[PDB]
Ligand binder design. Structure first.
Ligand SMILES: O=C(O)c1ccccc1OC(F)(F)F
Ligand SMILES: O=C(O)c1ccccc1OC(F)(F)F
Lengths: 171, 172, 171, 172
């Protein structure tokens, strides 16, 4: 009965269960030495990568407690999403982000491609929480539309200021 | 928010309260159990109650929480200050909901008349629900913000609109 | 062909032409000594006041160049409106405001009733423009909905900070 | 924005340009008339052109605008800075559109590849239109912001998305 339930610690960051068999994450957090994930051998896992966005489809239900949600290739410009950040502290941190255009976007010295957005906290977090930290990568971008939650990508990067974030998206 | 702030948040009646010092506990008036004659081992006799509408402050005659340092409680915060509401949810999960504070207001929220410092949640578009917004069970949860050095507490969770987006913090 | 066209200097502030015969303004800006407005005698003008919101209906078309727009009693909580500020300088200043609840709201020492909102400029204007000044009262609150512009009230007050505004609304 | 800043905004080709000093005029590359051999009485011969994609700077050999003081032009602004875009519209109307600036970006805007400092308009929800947003005619309009004492200029209007909400400022 909760979206928070779907946000799972993974590699150097997090990922998100879209359904009992589909898990999405940020490509840079995935382990580079692995034979199995969540007790299924890589043998049995379809991997689909598109830049900083990776989708895994398992051959058996890993989370049969979940129903399948809508996944979309980003959202309409001006949509206000929630980035669902979990911290190792036990803290849950849903932050509002106004989404902008698809772009390639030089984020502290790095070329990153995805949908840009700006945190509504503007306070421009520098250790009060209120913004993202490197450890948060792979957290999902969701919003409510009619009666349904939509997930439209995963957290790939953020600028020192904290104002600008990049959501990696399905191709 | 630091653990010593989470530490001050106590389960109380139909919601929560917050330890400002070893002898001072604050909460929302409507969560206080109406028939209670004793709190933390002390009878009403031994407790100073100060009530102003939906804000209630208890001062005990002995240190109930000697592990704590006295903190700054202020009468709300400056307009435009972004606060965290320290909400505990099922399973030792900590939910510090970001809120932009505005004006001292009076409102009718679902039949009932409410007075305090209004704010708007910064967690999502329609914050209607337990995942992005408040629930009745969160009443009494403290509003807090970090200054240059400090954290300060400025009120307790009293109400939210059917939409989710607007909250009311009751104030000293 | 422009919404800006409908924003007309008036008394100590402004008002807005909803149609050729209907003009809305903030009650406190209206002149307290008058026999005619826009060349029609008060004789011929229906006045409807509700607190800080006043509607005038003329007996003849004053602005027959305009079509009639939708007027609504405030908007849904979380709607992002535009306050259409005109300055005596010639400047046009559309500012985004996220609307909140109907409330009575003590704004620098004054009881004002209407829909509260917060300026997205957050910078909290103190002489860069980016916020309202007393002279701006009566400016309309509009937003786009399907193919139609909606007007849902007029600017009645703002806090020193600049963050909080009150939109006066139809009863 | 002060009148001495509005004063610097000149009608130029398919849009606008801006006088940084008596001898320095900046604009968006794509508004420059392609067949022009003379500007403000001077032939190309006598003008220093510096071009970096969609930003063009002209330095003349004589004071074209001796009424002006030299101003600070910077290579864009810090992330989170709120700028004004100094747009002139039909009838001596002045439209300083509020924009929150973000990251140096590369985008495809309606078939065409664009590079500069991205921002989001603060004028309304869907800024699609001339009343809340930009139009093709606004290209070259300067981006400016007020500091403690100063105003600074940090780029010129190069592009906007079909939605309205995202703009691109080309930078030195
Ligand atoms: O001191 C205790 O017994 C205690 C134990 C767990 C949690 C809170 C406590 O403090 C108090 F609220 F005062 F009871
Ligand atoms: O100095 C002038 O002739 C002048 C007159 C009106 C507007 C701009 C002007 O400056 C210049 F752009 F340089 F032409």
């Amino acid at each position: 009965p909760t979206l928070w339930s779907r946000v799972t610690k993974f590699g150097s960051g997090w990922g998100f269960w879209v359904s009992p068999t589909v898990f999405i994450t940020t490509t840079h957090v995935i382990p580079t030495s692995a034979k199995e994930f969540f007790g299924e051998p890589l043998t049995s896992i379809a991997i689909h990568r598109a830049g900083e966005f990776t989708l895994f489809r398992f051959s058996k239900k890993i989370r049969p407690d979940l129903t399948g949600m809508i996944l979309e290739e980003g959202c309409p410009e001006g949509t206000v999403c929630s980035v669902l950040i979990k911290r190792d502290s036990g803290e849950l941190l849903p932050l509002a982000v106004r989404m902008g255009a698809i772009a390639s976007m030089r984020i502290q010295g790095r070329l990153v491609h995805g949908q840009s957005g700006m945190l509504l906290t503007g306070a421009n977090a520098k250790g009060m929480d209120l913004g993202t930290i490197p450890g948060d990568c792979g957290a999902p971008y969701v919003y409510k539309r009619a009666n349904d939650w939509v997930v439209c990508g995963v957290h790939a990067a953020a600028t020192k200021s904290g104002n600008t974030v990049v959501c990696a998206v399905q191709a």
